[PDB]
Subunit: 265 residues, 7 copies
Amino acid sequence: YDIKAVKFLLDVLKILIIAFIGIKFADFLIYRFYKLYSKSKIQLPQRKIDTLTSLTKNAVRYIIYFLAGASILKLFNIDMTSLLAVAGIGSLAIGFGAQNLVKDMISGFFIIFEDQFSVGDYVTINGISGTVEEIGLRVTKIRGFSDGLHIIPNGEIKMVTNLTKDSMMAVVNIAFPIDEDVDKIIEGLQEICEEVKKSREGPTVLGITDMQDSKLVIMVYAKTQPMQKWAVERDIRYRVKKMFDQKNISFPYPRTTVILSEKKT
Amino acid sequence: YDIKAVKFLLDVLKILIIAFIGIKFADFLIYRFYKLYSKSKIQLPQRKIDTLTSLTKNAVRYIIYFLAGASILKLFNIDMTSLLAVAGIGSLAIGFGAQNLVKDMISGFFIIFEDQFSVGDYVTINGISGTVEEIGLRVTKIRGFSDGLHIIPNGEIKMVTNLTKDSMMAVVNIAFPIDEDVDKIIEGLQEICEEVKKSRGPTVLGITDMQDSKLVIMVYAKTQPMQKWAVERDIRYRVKKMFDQKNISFPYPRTTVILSEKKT
Amino acid sequence: YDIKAVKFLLDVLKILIIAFIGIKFADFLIYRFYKLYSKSKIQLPQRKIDTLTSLTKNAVRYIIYFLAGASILKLFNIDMTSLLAVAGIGSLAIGFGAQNLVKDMISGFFIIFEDQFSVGDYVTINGISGTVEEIGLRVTKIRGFSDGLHIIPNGEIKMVTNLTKDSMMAVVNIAFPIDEDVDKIIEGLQEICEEVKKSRGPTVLGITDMQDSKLVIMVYAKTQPMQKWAVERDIRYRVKKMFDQKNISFPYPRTTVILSEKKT
Amino acid sequence: YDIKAVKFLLDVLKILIIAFIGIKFADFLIYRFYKLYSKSKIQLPQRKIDTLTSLTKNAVRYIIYFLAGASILKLFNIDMTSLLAVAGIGSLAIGFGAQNLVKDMISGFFIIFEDQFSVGDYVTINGISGTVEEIGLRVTKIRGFSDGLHIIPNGEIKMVTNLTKDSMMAVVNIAFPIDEDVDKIIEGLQEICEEVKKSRGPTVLGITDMQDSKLVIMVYAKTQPMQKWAVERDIRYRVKKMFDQKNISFPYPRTTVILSEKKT
Amino acid sequence: YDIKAVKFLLDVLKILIIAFIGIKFADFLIYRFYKLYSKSKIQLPQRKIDTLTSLTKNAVRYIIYFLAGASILKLFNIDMTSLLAVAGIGSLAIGFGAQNLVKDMISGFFIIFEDQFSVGDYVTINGISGTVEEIGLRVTKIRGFSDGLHIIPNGEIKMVTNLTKDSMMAVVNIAFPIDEDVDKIIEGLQEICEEVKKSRDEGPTVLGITDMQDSKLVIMVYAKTQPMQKWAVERDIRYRVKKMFDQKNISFPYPRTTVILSEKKT
Amino acid sequence: YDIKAVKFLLDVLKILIIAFIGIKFADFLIYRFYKLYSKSKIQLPQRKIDTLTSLTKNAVRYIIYFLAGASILKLFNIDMTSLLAVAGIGSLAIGFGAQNLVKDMISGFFIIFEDQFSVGDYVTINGISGTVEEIGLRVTKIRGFSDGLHIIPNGEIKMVTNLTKDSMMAVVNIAFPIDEDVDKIIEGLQEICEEVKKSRGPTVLGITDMQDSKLVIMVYAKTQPMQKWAVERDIRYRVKKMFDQKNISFPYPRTTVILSEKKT
Amino acid sequence: YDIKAVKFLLDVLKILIIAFIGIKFADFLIYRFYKLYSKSKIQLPQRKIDTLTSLTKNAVRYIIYFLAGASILKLFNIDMTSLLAVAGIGSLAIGFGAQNLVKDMISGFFIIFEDQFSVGDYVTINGISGTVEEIGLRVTKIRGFSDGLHIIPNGEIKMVTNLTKDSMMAVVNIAFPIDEDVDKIIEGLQEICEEVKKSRGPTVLGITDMQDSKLVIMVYAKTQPMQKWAVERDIRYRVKKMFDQKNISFPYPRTTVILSEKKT
Ligand SMILES: CCCCCCCCCCCCO[C@@H]1O[C@H](CO)[C@@H](O[C@H]2O[C@H](CO)[C@@H](O)[C@H](O)[C@H]2O)[C@H](O)[C@H]1O
Ligand SMILES: CCCCCCCCCCCCO[C@@H]1O[C@H](CO)[C@@H](O[C@H]2O[C@H](CO)[C@@H](O)[C@H](O)[C@H]2O)[C@H](O)[C@H]1O
């Protein structure tokens, strides 16, 4: 009948009493981390935080059941490495699945901690531009106009270009025919920058920026206060159109030279 | 004949009795997690949940068989690290295979918990736009019109743009010839915004783009959720008729050509 | 000469007898999992299931040989962590190789368990559309017409759009010249929807797009599963004939040219 | 001088004798797995299988040397976890490198075991089409005509579309001007299907697409494996001649131009 | 009643006292790594470094609670490998999540340590060009003109091309009609290089006809220019080429199409 | 003062003497693996193999220093798992870094062992075509003409299409106007195949494609390895001259225009 | 009060003294690996190597602090596997972060050791072409003309094509109208190769492509390293002048139009 059979009992006992203490203690701490976020009603409708509370309860129960079971099993001569080879299917699947969640959060943490963009400026993130409306630490929300509300997981942000930082820059690339008088148009554009400066950096006439088949491209650019940009550009375009009509300068219509051939069928 | 030969027996015994208790206990808990989801008939046809029940039964049997066998093997001087190097081929294959499933679920969990889109709005998810019909936590189902029902694993969602949140925005980019009177057309579009406001933006933002023979002015209006593409169509019809009445010429591509005196 | 030299023998002995029992037991269980799937001839030609039986036999032999060998090696003072560092080259290679297989299967499991598509509807899976012919749990087979039979491993399915669920939707985007009378054509299309309704939507949604010399009005109709592309063709024929009777001019591109006085 | 110094010797001894037994035994088994595949000359030129034999020899030598050395080191108080941290650089590098090889093989195993394609049909695998010439379990070889012999590692196969299964399908999309009589052409194509049926589908499916100046009607026919592109060519020749006899005008783009009075 | 029951107590005791010493010691070191970066006010508004301080506090509390708890559990016969199979879900999730952060940092470390680009030159990084404004070790900030301020995590930099190193190079590809006199234009461009050399900033030179197309012919002029002098030189050269085209009366590279006329109807 | 203090010394001693033996033995084996590859001067300039020799020396030194230090540390009550958590940063970094090297090598091993391409044929590997000049087992070198010498790591090879195996195939797709006599041209091409056969396929496969104003007939011929592009050029010249003699009109795009009476 | 309380002290003592010896010894070795690279001033400004020295100091301090702390913790009954689950968050993050660095270096090591390109030739690496200026083992620096200095981490090199190895190859694809005399132009190009050979290939390979209104003959020549793009320009100038003298008409697109009698 041996002498250990009592010690053994002390062992399965130790596991049971520790697991019990554990459950009750967890239920306590959870009911407290509950008490707080619940009684103040700072954020989060109840319907959700209840689902989240039972989420945590369930998680901790399953963990405790698993540890106590595994331990008792050890007590009956079951090999824990083999058990590891089973349980680790889930260590691996959950661990690697959750990695992305951790990524999003670290990402968000920096976005915020480094004030990459404040809860209101107009940015472009991953070829998607819009005005930032919300900045959680798992997701940034950005609504472009005409485009919808984009919800973007912070981890996916590979680069965030901010459009409205230390100001903004407006550009217009005007196109003329090379079959055209350069100095007259550069003069006209000069006069347009002149006039625009008069209604509240630039705007200036940078040289002929590109030379093409039948066209010739001169850009005007101006440094503008945050957001006044696309507006400035539209002002400038209207100005260029009217200037084209008054100075009677011919338009950049593509043109062909054609050679005729004497044949039939 | 030694003294351990009885202890040894106690050990292979301990494994067998614990694995037996284990099986019966699992059969019990499974027949209970069965009893519940089965007797209430809340969801899921039986034909399926039966397949799923035998799934869990089989899984638990294989796990138990493996643990008990491995343990007995240990009892006969078989090295458990080597065993691990065998069994882990499966730990790794299953573990990393299942990772994606875990991903889908965490994904869905947030989509729901963060009300990213309600079981009814019109969204666009990975270059695919449609009306959300179902939101499980493993899959979102979205049917675009003319396009079919799309079933998208929640994990694949890299971004979800919602089109019908705090409202919507309608745009029309009208194109004219530069060989054209700007103020007359901008005046006409002004009159069209005027008129459209009258039936329950819309505004004329400047010339937004300047091209070879064209010139492009956009009108835009903030619209209640979904009235959007509709507003746009209203505005288009209006612009067509306005073009006919004001007799403004159309944005046909215009080429200017030069003739050459040759032969062959 | 010591005292253990007998115990040692008991240990190498324990390994050998357990490995022997193991082999014979495995051969048994395999000859049984054989007996079943073999004597009923439910599926799978013999030539294959024989190759698959010897596959399982060989695997189990190699695993047993490896575990027994590794254990005996342990008995001669060979370090099992170093052995692990060797054997795990294969644990890793096989484990990560097989992960994909496990992926395909979980994937298939859901496709079926969730009736994503039945053994007969017309779906599109990864930019490839066709009629589903077979649905295993490792591979879906889909044959498009004119396109061949596609065998797609279930894991590769990133999204599966079903075209024939709660019905279908037919669209036709009719193109006119903007140099054209809108209301006459919209009237004609109205008459065509009218007439098509009469043979067992279809409706005129506004001008959906406005281009350089064109203008685009869509007609759309909700159709029973598969009657779709058919409806569309009916509607096209109708629109062509309507264009001929109403004598409406065709959406030919149009260019206005300006002539220039030069030479060479 | 102690009492263990003899036991220690028994231990370094045990390792040496086991490693020696191991080497000799491996050299034996290798010379046997050699004897077989060598004396029958079933496949593989000698020059190669020699290189492969010394490959196995060397592999086994290095593994044995490493295990014996590591074990002796353990005997001199060298920590085996630290050793693992060294040796695992190679465990990881080899393990993960070889993963792809394991992938190719599992992949090939299924391609074969599931008769996805027989050693002779015309398939398309990863946007590359051709006739399968060889099917190993690590590589499929496919030669398109005019295109060269493609050797594709089985693992890279993400999808395999078979073109010559339960038959084949031939299509021809005929293009007409919309400025054209529909029923005359549809009648002519009817007559062409009629005539083609007579030489050992083919049917006129409606107007499948409507474009700027064109209109597209497709004819299609179910054909025996490979007779396909051939049927299509027959049908094309027929359609050309039919165009010449029925004198129907060709689908040349057409543009309408407007002339403008200007200068420079 | 046994004899160990006192030793056991010594063990749970040992854990508790070590964990307590640990907490207090960490609070100390944290309050010191605090004292420094805080009292000098070298960088970082307080509002942030407070959030960061409580971050480190909380981290270390959770780690200590977990270690002590796990160790007591071990004391009550709880298997630590099974525990590992639970806790490693987090080992793996955090570890692999944080990998990217470590990447960014090693990346930045080299960018800086190798002076790949100084806090002022004009670079192009991942198809995105601009002037570098800030170089942290986690992020490079680059503002293109007309383009906005780009904040790029250092890890994402797969290649960094610098445009303003040992100088710069200006190019202009001039296009003519093949229906044209080559030597007259090559002569004119020669005269333009000549004249541009005369206004201050290697080149500019007339490299041969670099490309031949349907109705066009393309001759490039190029010049080595001091850092940033570049796009400017190019614009000078373009203006010069336009005016040269007007004076030398050379005809423009308009696309040209020969047409053949056909006698038909409908 | 205790009794172990001498045993302890025996332990740090055992580590030091084993590590010393280790170093000297490694220096030996390295100076031998040196002696061989060095005195025969089979390949590799000295300047390199010297750098490689000191590489191996240094590696082995660092490994030995680390093992012995780690072991002594263990002797002073330092925990080896925590050590592992440090040292494994490097285990992981080096192990996963080197994985690609192992990949390249296994890859090259098969390329060679399977004679996928001999040190001289013209292949295309990853959208890059050229003549193979060198085949190492870590890198294949291929020089296309006009294109430069490409050095490609063997691991990056996802597919290798060989162009010059069991021969080659030459294709020419001749384009005519549909506004054209089919049989006259097919006749002419017949005569060209006839004539080309006469100088040491080629055949007229039907009209392989039908387009807006064009019609495309292909001729194809099976040619000895490399004579291919050459054959094609022969055939093209032939087709041009045949076009000139048979006076057949060229496949110029043709557009029918409609004229409109307007202004501005 | 027990008997161990002194041994325990010996243990925490052992850790402290070994850690102290450890620190001092590391400070020494670091101050030596400092002494060398510092007093010779071979490379690296001081400002940097100082930052790098304190880097190594700090690294070693943190590792030592962590090992000693972990070990004392172990002494107070703290479980080391739990500790590992904590500390390995960093093992994994650092280990996998640094993997890329290890990759770059192995990569560079081969680039150099295999003289893939010398500190001076013109190469193209990942669709980016330029002259190599520097070759470190972590980064290759290449400056294209007009393009800037590219700094490329060696690990990112997937393929390196060298343009200036065993020489170079120059190509010019001349385009003519098919409406043209082939033999006259092929004759002229022959004369141009003739003349170019005269100033220190070049050959007329057949008509390499046949298009709608064009026809393309390539001339090619094998040229000394770098003389290539230059040769090509010579050849182009020659072809233009040859076109002017032989009066051959230019490859202008040509379109045949058909006129239609309509209105609006
Ligand atoms: C969760 C705790 C935090 C992570 C701690 C990581 C510290 C860094 C340690 C790197 C040591 C690498 O050393 C490596 O160990 C692993 C153990 O998984 C062994 O891996 C071996 O056994 C496993 C068992 O599951 C097999 O599935 C695997 O295929 C096989 O290679 C390698 O053969 C060995 O080379
Ligand atoms: C093969 C294994 C590969 C392992 C790779 C090793 C990873 C480390 C890569 C470089 C990390 C960045 O290097 C970073 O430099 C700064 C100095 O600018 C260090 O900063 C250091 O000096 C500063 C003074 O300003 C102190 O505040 C700090 O206590 C100290 O650590 C950072 O602590 C270090 O993180």
